Symmetry: D3
Subunit: 251 residues, 6 copies
């Protein structure tokens, strides 16, 4: 139950990821063999729930690619449920301030370090109580990544970076650009400056910067600035664009 | 992605609907061909979730009947999820006051007009980014219908009618009668007076009144008073009553 | 595990049925409460399989209405699987002669009376070995109903009626009229005479005649002639026709 | 729709239960025949949702074992949904004080006794309006069991016991031991003393004590002290431990 | 219910296709918007069944791309079921001779032209009896495509082409190369000559040649020779190869 | 893609198995961690199909326990489909003679050694063409186990054992005892002698004997005689018997 993604971040090894929105355990397996370091199972903007997360975790399990799950909100009940099905790395949307970051962290930890509900006999997370001393080992292998998605969050970043248990800070360029007045479109100097400044500041605190970016040149730029978990494409996009380009080549 | 239901309301064309609680994409398709103007996929009182809403939207899509979705609550996270799977007309339960109406509206609109989270690449709503300029076009095709279901809501109706983006106000007779002391049974003069007064007042503000009513005579009465989205039956009821009547005719 | 439908036919008590093509455990339960004596779960012309038959059986179980299952063909493997999930009454399509009727019967019976494969530890049929002496008791509670759907089958009816274990013979008017040259339209005197004569011949042989007929006056006619299992309507038709009629009343 | 579990508690007949976390309508049926008084469908620590609760209720229905459902949280919207699919006995997690206990109760009752939303035509709970006078009969057959899981809840127990409509108070030993500093492991004198004291105090108020305990000797001890709903094992545990022991016997 | 794919082949308009093996109604919709003329829902080499074919048909329905379904075998029972959920164009594998081609055709046609079983009240194919004169109109809109996959089938091609109702003949290069001794590797001159000669012979008989080929230059070659239904890629391959290429660009 | 179960049988290392009839990917994972050498996914007597076999394969994949799949019949089409989702070890029921054994073997092998259809781009079996030279490597890692379940099959055992590609012969005591006139009750000396003699004859031919037996002392006896794949219990039985015993201890 060692969290190898968490360990790679702490060691400064950049992790290249693919976003999964196809909400299918079958395509998840197909993509798990493609060579990524991590895969993001999106519970916020794709039609997933705890049960489909579970089947995608099962599909991914024998492969080297490490799963990360995005809950629909920073909701301790939903987080509890995701952790019991075996989630160990969470990408939490819309974290606006340090109090919210701390709540995300505490939702992942058993008392006294947090408020995670205890239900080990029933949980894939403990392999139904086969993992010895699960209750004592679990807190240390949880990896909490928080998303900053607004001007308010950018302003609070220093305080967020000070929250123990926040392992990574992810910048969401679509939401951030929208909040900044550019309608979800991030290729604007002001948006890029905000993104790049944050990446530097995050890395300077010893924490991992993350981002999703489908432009490969920008992905490399962010990596050069110190980003450590970078998602470089989206399954639905890869499929739709490849199919459309193919059809067009035949008229 | 033009919302034709929204446009019909704005033009004063009454829309006759059927409520869908069978929670099945197969019966949804069968009913989509029956000639209704709109179909209500009930996420509040039927066993639906975001995934079953999606498959019912897919089933309904080639037919002329327009889908409307009822979330389980006025919850911005659930609303975000429903919109990303392609919902454009929402019937929001238990809206008690103008602040709650405004929150329902803002949950449907991208910044700065609202707080809708951006996730277009992943969404059926944008057809996975095939709809050009989706982010700029989407807000205008969202149709927000709010339910008034209590004496408190009836008292706040004038203020609710003043909220921009509230396109329609729906009266729920079962909940309202229960709140008024008649245990969910609306055939009482006091309940009828409250319902009919509201319909007039709603229509007078230039907004669309709506209601569900399985009594056909009352449905016509409400339409005569200016109601514009009237659901005139429920799939589960139509099926159960037809089957029971058939069995009884054979002993 | 007593087969009450089988016992009712044997006692000459007419059983009034409803056909289930909605392929849903949810609507199956709703309909199980409507007062029918039997419900036909259609695996031939509706999108069912062994798994959906199982869930419909579970839904129907606490109600008085008795389930009957139609496999897609007279296939001993498919019959084996349906019996293991708990099916005790089978309506077998396209039985053309006595050899085929005997094959259907033998598929339902353990050796030496048949070729039914043994796997009771695993099966709902034995309640996972909780029913005592299941292997000894099962054969006697199987009820095999065979469909005659062609002129060839009608010619062979006398021989079919002589097969031990054939408890009932069902006439399919749609298939039969098509075979006779009337394109699935059974309201033609030559077709009605063939159906009436069969019903009489079946009843005179001391076996149960069955049929499906959505015309309530024809149903009553066939019951008058001695039909013992008569399905009087179809769920999809009930729902579609009720919905269409309702929409049309509002224009 | 009489709630026989509720009645057994009120009469002081101890009810022996099994916890269901396999989240399957198939194993639920298999276990429903095993001889327990009650079965707990866990929506908090197993991958269930309203739809899987529904299918497990359907599977259990013909058996004598009575279902109890644990929602993921004391959430009135989730409770509304569970009740409409037919849940009549709820085990509510993390009830910390009398206000929260009262909210749990009110979520189960129609106005004016509570805030349960009205949606009877659509609901399995009313058998789609077949149960006569459902709206007037339902409140009295709801059984609310609240979990005390923290030192704070133990301190508030007297006040919780004073809340009308709280039928039972359940002690969760894993969560309680964790909150008390023993990492989810309850075999410590301080934890046992707290548990046994609570059971006595609960029973003294005329309300039903409950607990889950897989140690059979402790289960008997708690029953001797007056516990009335005692779950004595967990499906996932029974299966995993039996399978592991079997494999080990063969090397 | 006009079969537009069938009409296009008959008019000699080349139709460009994409193979669907992801077995998902969700990715089917995403791909239905990509601009292909036809989409092949593979029930032979992907984990589909009648139920998943149905949901993919529903997903594809509002788009211009036309569905074609491959059953697992030339099995009249399976064909009956696929046609009842709405399939109008079938790609039948392993058709070895004229008798087998005639069997495939007859499985799709109502008596007297075939043995298709009648069950239109129940079926999506007739929109649950809403399509007027369905029984009379259906035969003419069925399009049967047969696969020649062996040397034996190639030898019998002239006779196969003479079967009335065979609208198209599809060459499977993987199976054919394997049968000819090149282990599913069709890039060998003896295999390419057999494929080219077949394409020409098919087109000269006034029927439509088809093929699947992921090499875009070979596809263009076969179109130049007269192939009329050409699948140019496979969803799983598009996705896997795009993902793998992306991961590799980041090392 | 090395078949480790096949290699263990060939090396004479006894493999201890558990039968899986719960038809759930969730319980399959729980059981995959219990320490068995092999797990039998039963498609003949449990409600499985190709789709549920796939998800169970995915669940089991990261564990050491090796999957074996039983199709419902010796059907080459069903075998093709099971192999494409990744099945490498098959337990084929009701193999009565050498011709049928050879048919089972040939169904698993690509031409010229068999008739397995080629569709590797699409299949999990090749990891969607990611396994290099899959077409060349696959045949050698298929393991075919045939069931002898009748007196006729026992008579033909010598010839069956002479079929190249038959790696193991499994005796089904339930079916065999039924065929011999002991109604699925194999605890009769004539049945035990037939089973013992078969085990010895199989092992002496240099092939692997197998059996299912829930009596642990008989299992140990058959292992002593040379049986190489022995299933020692069934999931549904383990669960049902553990639950029933537990309930009974509390009365
Ligand atoms: O659980 C059954 C669903 O609600 C209807 O498909
Ligand atoms: O509803 C379709 C799912 O989201 C994809 O399997
Ligand atoms: O995801 C697997 C379910 O939780 C058990 O049926
Ligand atoms: Co975002
Ligand atoms: Co309401
Ligand atoms: Co018929
Ligand atoms: Co607890
Ligand atoms: Co082929
Ligand atoms: Co057997």
């Amino acid at each position: 139950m060692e969290n190898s993604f968490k360990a790679a971040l702490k060691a400064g090894r950049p992790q290249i990821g693919l976003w999964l929105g196809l909400s299918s355990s079958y395509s998840a397996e197909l993509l798990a063999g493609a060579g990524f370091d991590w895969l993001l199972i999106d519970g916020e903007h794709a039609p997933n729930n705890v049960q489909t997360v579970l089947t995608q975790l099962q599909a991914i399990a024998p492969y080297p690619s490490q799963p990360v799950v995005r809950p629909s909100w920073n909701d301790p009940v939903q987080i509890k449920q995701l952790l019991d099905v075996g989630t160990q790395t969470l990408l939490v949307p819309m974290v606006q301030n340090a109090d919210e970051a701390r709540e995300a962290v505490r939702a992942t930890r058993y008392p006294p370090a947090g408020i995670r509900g205890v239900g080990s006999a029933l949980a894939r997370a403990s392999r139904w109580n086969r993992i010895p001393d699960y209750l004592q080992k679990a807190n240390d292998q949880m990896c909490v990544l928080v998303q900053i998605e607004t001007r308010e969050a950018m302003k609070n970043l220093p305080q967020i970076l000070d929250v123990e248990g926040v392992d990574g800070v992810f910048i969401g360029p679509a939401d951030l650009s929208a909040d900044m007045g550019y309608a979800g479109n991030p290729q604007h100097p002001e948006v890029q400056a905000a993104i790049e400044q944050a990446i530097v500041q995050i890395r300077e605190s010893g924490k991992a910067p993350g981002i999703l970016i489908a432009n490969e040149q920008l992905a490399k730029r962010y990596l050069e600035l110190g980003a450590l978990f970078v998602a470089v494409g989206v399954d639905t996009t890869l499929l739709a664009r490849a199919a459309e380009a193919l059809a067009a080549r035949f008229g």
